[PDB]
Design a protein around this ligand. Structure first.
Ligand SMILES: COC(=O)Nc1ccc2c(c1)NC(=O)[C@H](C)CCC[C@H](NC(=O)c1cnn(-c3cccc(Cl)c3F)c1N)c1cc-2ccn1
Length: 238
C-alpha cells in the first residue's frame, strides 16, 4: 500500500496473509475470509502453484513478525480458480481457497459480507484497500498491515485511463486523479472493503494497475458483486 497508514489490531478481521512454503516460506498475496472454510482472493496469485499443499493461510495477523514456525495457520484443501480466468488484465481474477479446517470466529478473525444483488445500484463512499505490499514500486513486503481510503471511479472514467485495455463491468476501479494512495506489489488478492449502512462489504479484490499510485491510473479490482452467483455455486455445492 502506497500512502497508507498502519492498521490497528482487529481493524480488518477478514484480512488474511496467504503464504507459500516452496521453496521457502514467504507472504504471497492477501485474501478475505468469506465463510468458515472459505478465503476469497485473486486467481493470478496461483501462477505456477502446482499444489494446495504449499499454501498456508494466516488470519488474525497485524504484523508479519507474528508468523514463526510455531504460529498456527489454516491448510488449503482445494484451490478453486474461475475457469474463464486467463490473466488479471482480462478479468475473472477470482479464486476460492477451501480450508482443511474451520475458522473459529472471534474479534481477531471473522467474515466480510459479500455485496448484495440489490447493492449493485448503491454508491459506496467509504472504501479501503489493505495489505502488506510495497509502499513504492521497488520496495519490500511491510511488517504491519497498511490501509488507505480510496474513492471508487466509474467504469467510463476507468476506461479513459486505460487506453488499450477493455475495462469490463466485472471490473471495478478506484483511485485519486492525482495518485498518491493505492495498492502495490504484494497487496493483490486482498480486499477493497466498503462500509455501507454501518456494514462492511467486500466490493473488490486487488487485481491489477499500471505501476502503483500513479496519477490517472486507477487500481483495477475484481467487481465482487458480479461473482456472487459464482461464489455461491462453488461454496454451496450440494
Ligand atoms: C518476503 O516475501 C515477499 O517478498 N513476498 C512477495 C513479494 C512480492 C510479491 C509477492 C510476494 N507475490 C507474488 O509474487 C505473487 C505470485 C503475486 C504476483 C502479482 C503481484 N502483483 C501485484 O501485487 C499487483 C499488480 N498490480 N497491482 C496493483 C497496483 C495498483 C492498484 C491495484 Cl488495485 C493493483 F492491483 C498489484 N497490487 C506481485 C506480487 C509480488 C511481486 C510482484 N507482483
Amino acid at each position: 500500500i502506497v500512502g497508507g497508514t498502519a492498521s490497528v489490531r482487529g481493524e480488518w478481521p477478514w484480512q488474511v496473509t496467504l503464504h507459500t512454503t516452496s521453496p521457502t516460506q514467504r507472504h504471497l498475496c492477501g485474501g478475505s475470509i468469506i465463510g468458515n472454510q472459505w478465503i476469497l482472493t485473486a486467481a493470478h496469485c496461483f501462477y505456477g502453484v502446482e499444489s494446495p499443499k504449499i499454501l498456508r493461510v494466516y488470519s488474525g495477523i497485524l504484523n508479519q513478525s507474528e508468523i514463526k514456525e510455531d504460529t498456527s495457520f489454516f491448510g488449503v484443501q482445494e484451490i478453486i480458480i474461475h475457469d474463464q480466468y486467463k490473466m488479471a488484465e482480462s478479468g475473472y481474477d477470482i479464486a476460492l481457497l477451501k480450508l482443511e479446517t474451520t475458522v473459529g470466529y472471534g474479534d481477531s478473525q471473522r467474515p466480510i459480507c459479500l455485496p448484495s444483488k440489490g447493492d449493485r445500484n448503491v454508491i459506496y463512499t467509504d472504501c479501503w484497500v489493505t495489505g502488506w505490499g510495497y509502499r513504492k514500486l521497488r520496495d519490500k513486503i511491510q511488517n504491519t498491515l497498511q490501509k488507505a481510503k480510496i474513492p471508487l471511479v466509474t467504469n467510463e472514467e476507468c476506461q479513459k485511463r486505460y487506453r488499450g485495455h477493455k475495462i469490463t463491468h466485472k471490473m471495478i476501479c478506484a483511485g485519486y486523479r492525482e495518485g498518491g494512495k493505492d495498492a502495490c506489489k504484494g497487496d493483490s488478492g486482498g480486499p477493497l472493503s466498503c462500509k455501507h449502512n454501518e456494514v462492511w462489504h467486500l466490493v473488490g479484490i486487488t487485481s491489477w494497475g499500471e505501476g502503483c499510485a500513479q496519477r490517472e491510473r486507477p487500481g483495477v479490482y475484481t467487481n465482487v458483486v458480479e461473482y456472487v452467483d459464482w461464489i455461491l455455486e462453488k461454496t454451496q455445492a450440494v
